[PDB]
Amino acid sequence: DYTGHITWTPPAIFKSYCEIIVTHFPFDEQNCSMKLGTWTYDGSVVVINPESDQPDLSNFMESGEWVIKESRGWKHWVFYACCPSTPYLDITYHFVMQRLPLYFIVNVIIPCLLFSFLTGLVFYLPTDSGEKMTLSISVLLSLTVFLLVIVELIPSTSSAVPLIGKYMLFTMVFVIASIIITVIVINTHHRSPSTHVMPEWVRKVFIDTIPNIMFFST
């Protein structure tokens, strides 16, 4: 302007470092910031003030993965011990974002839930079918194959265990315990008088005590 007022509105692609908390993934909330300042000019020679308290979101395109819940901008004065007269100014704009979790609910959590349900169905399968181990081992193999999907989709961070990662580990331990216990059941089912003698505690528990809470020829 003739007054001498300069307005400059350049675009930029900002690639900013943000502490990411994966504790509650895929239901996590992130708070990511953009600290901006005059690199070589201090506050005594250049003063920077925010235009508004908040970033401008009037031309914000909708994000398909995150919802911006909060946004604000704060100015900070920083003084050093060796220099009590020159402040260092910055403006940090932060954005509190919430992830939309439907993608990871559908593509990770639901198959894990289905495998968790399929884990327990081997205990209603009789041993005489000759299919107990096939069912259990195939459930384990389905989880092992699904680990490819999980590794390709869930981030490889070691700051914390994701909640989805805990669910995966719980399911995998569950199927492994199911396989061990099914092996014990099958070993019990082929016990014979020729190779084994029934202990009195097994008879006192499983043939008379437990069954009284349930129904069968006994």
């Binding site: 398909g64 992830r99 939309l100 439907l102 198959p111 096939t134 389905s142 194959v145």
Partner: peptide, 26 residues
């Protein structure tokens, strides 16, 4: 049970096939 559970194993392989192509929006 062999047929019914190995169909699910193949379907998990198809989950890996589809996870490489579908968009990652929610």
């Amino acid at each position: 049970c062999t047929v019914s559970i190995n169909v699910l194993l193949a379907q998990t392989v198809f989950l890996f096939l589809i996870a490489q192509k579908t968009p990652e929006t929610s």
